[PDB]
Every structure is written in C-alpha cells, then in structure tokens.
C-alpha cells in the first residue's frame, strides 16, 4: 500500500460528455422556452409558476455553463481560475436555489391547501417579496466558501478544477453541510408539509376540484429520486474519509466513479420543470 492512486475510466470520458451535452441541449431549449413563455409574455396564472420561473432561471444559469463540465470530462481545464471559480459558484448557487424553490413550492401548497380560507395575502407575499431574501440571499451567502476555496490545480497531469481544501476534515464538514442543506432539512420540511396536506385533504373528501398538487408532487419526487444516489455516494465517501470504512482503496475508487456517474445522471433535473410544463403532468 504505497498511497491512494487516481484513475478515471475510459468509458466515463465519452459517456459523461454525451450525458452533459444531452442535458445541456434539453435544458437550454426547455428553460429558454419556459422563460420566453411565462416571464416575458405574462402567461403565468397560478402562484407556483413564479417559483417555477425562478427554478428555470437557476436551471438556465447551470445549463449555460454545463459545456465547461462537458469539456472538463474529456479534456483538461485550460480555461482559467476565473472560469473555474465562476462555474463552481453558479453550480453551487443553482443546486441550493432549486432545493429552496422546491421547499417554497411545498410551503405554498401547504398554505393553499390547509389554510384555504384565510391565506391570500401571505401566499402573494411568499410569491413576490420574501422568496428572494429566503431563497437567493441564503444561496449567495452560502457559496462564498465555494468562492474562496475552489481553485484550479497546477499539477502536471489533467489540470484539475475542483473545490480545494487544506485538510481532509474540511471536505468532510463541507460534504455533511452539503447533505444537510440539500437533502435532510428540506426533505424534512417537504415531508412534514405534505403529510399535513394529505392529513387535511382526507378530511375534505366530499369535494374534489383541485389537482394542482399532482404536478408539484411529481416534480419534487422526480427531483429527489434524481438526487438521492449522489447523496448516498457522497455520504459513503464522507464516512470513508473518517477512516471508518477501511475496506480498501478499490472501494474508494468505485465510490469516486459512482459519484461522478451519478452526478452526471443527477444533473437530469434540468429537464424536469420544462418537461413537466410540456407534458402538463
């Protein structure tokens, strides 16, 4: 056991640019059409479409520089420190902003279904004013350690652009904060809100008129089903870095292949809002 080696598979240097280009194409068409239909021609009517517009804006921001990840998957990062920092900071702000928009979607659905009578002012207030200061401003202030720490390496091989940390404990606390911000706390909020939604909707089985819950339920379920195995992979990697799972270097190579492939497959939430807009599902 000399050290821990690094090796990327030759199939992941062709399949991952294919997946990145597919997601980039469907994201750029879908989010451009969604922006040009709702946010420009004033077509949006329901209260959740403002949140879907914000989600499509963050989705467009991630999709427009997904080609840099597509080039990085097969080539080396000859773009620079500025482009590496910018790609990382807008990937982080998109990945947190989409989660916070989905939490706000579930909160608006809870305020509309449970408080059906006395909630028209705070639904509109959540639609216009506090959504910025509760979704974007925590996301912009939560990505300044991504702004500081992310750099491009000057290693003679592969010129890697990644979030570079001083020691291995910083990787652990940042991955745990990544999990606790992306999956655990908003998943708890969304699950509790939807449990209260169904518990108060089963008391009102005598009238069945609204089915705007199905679209948001499908969107949230598809988002979490897309992002779940990447969170499992980074949780297993984080517990590997604690020297708890001492099951060999080959496990730490399989985990790092799984993380990359599953992150490429979990970028497929870019075609989730406009695909659900086209299908009306």
């Amino acid at each position: 056991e000399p050290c821990f080696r690094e090796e990327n598979a030759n199939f992941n240097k062709i399949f991952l640019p294919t997946i990145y280009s597919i997601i980039f194409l469907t994201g750029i068409v879908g989010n451009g059409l969604v922006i040009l239909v709702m946010g420009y021609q004033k077509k949006l009517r329901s209260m959740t479409d403002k949140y879907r517009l914000h989600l499509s804006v963050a989705d467009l921001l991630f999709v427009i520089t997904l080609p840099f990840w597509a080039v990085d998957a097969v080539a080396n990062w000859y773009f620079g420190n500025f482009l590496c920092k910018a790609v990382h900071v807008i990937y982080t702000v998109n990945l947190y902003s989409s989660v916070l928009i989905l939490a706000f979607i579930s909160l608006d659905r809870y305020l509309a279904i449970v408080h059906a009578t006395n909630s028209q002012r705070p639904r509109k207030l959540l639609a216009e004013k506090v959504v910025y200061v509760g979704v974007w401003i925590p996301a912009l202030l939560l990505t300044i350690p991504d702004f500081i720490f992310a750099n491009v390496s000057e290693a003679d091989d592969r010129y890697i652009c990644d979030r570079f940390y001083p020691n291995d404990l910083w990787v652990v606390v940042f991955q745990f904060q990544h999990i606790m911000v992306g999956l655990i706390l908003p998943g708890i909020v969304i699950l509790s809100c939807y449990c209260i939604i169904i518990s108060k909707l089963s008391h009102s089985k005598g009238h069945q008129k609204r089915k705007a819950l199905k679209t948001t339920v499908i969107l949230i379920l598809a988002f979490f089903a897309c992002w779940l195995p990447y969170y499992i992979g980074i949780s297993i990697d984080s517990f590997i870095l604690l020297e708890i799972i001492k099951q060999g270097c080959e496990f730490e190579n399989t985990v790092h292949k799984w993380i990359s492939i599953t992150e490429a497959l979990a970028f497929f939430h870019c075609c989730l809002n406009p695909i659900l807009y086209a299908f009306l599902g």
Partner: peptide
C-alpha cells in the same frame, strides 16, 4: 515516508498519504 500528490484534498481527486 511514502508520499502522494501534496495538497490534492477536495471534493474529487482527494488522496491521503501514509505516515511511517
């Protein structure tokens, strides 16, 4: 003391040297 690439400790391409 066996060594590795020095300050490669991040989200990806992170390693760990072996002490003597």
């Amino acid at each position: 003391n066996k060594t590795v690439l020095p300050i490669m400790s991040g989200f990806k391409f992170h390693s760990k040297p072996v002490i003597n």
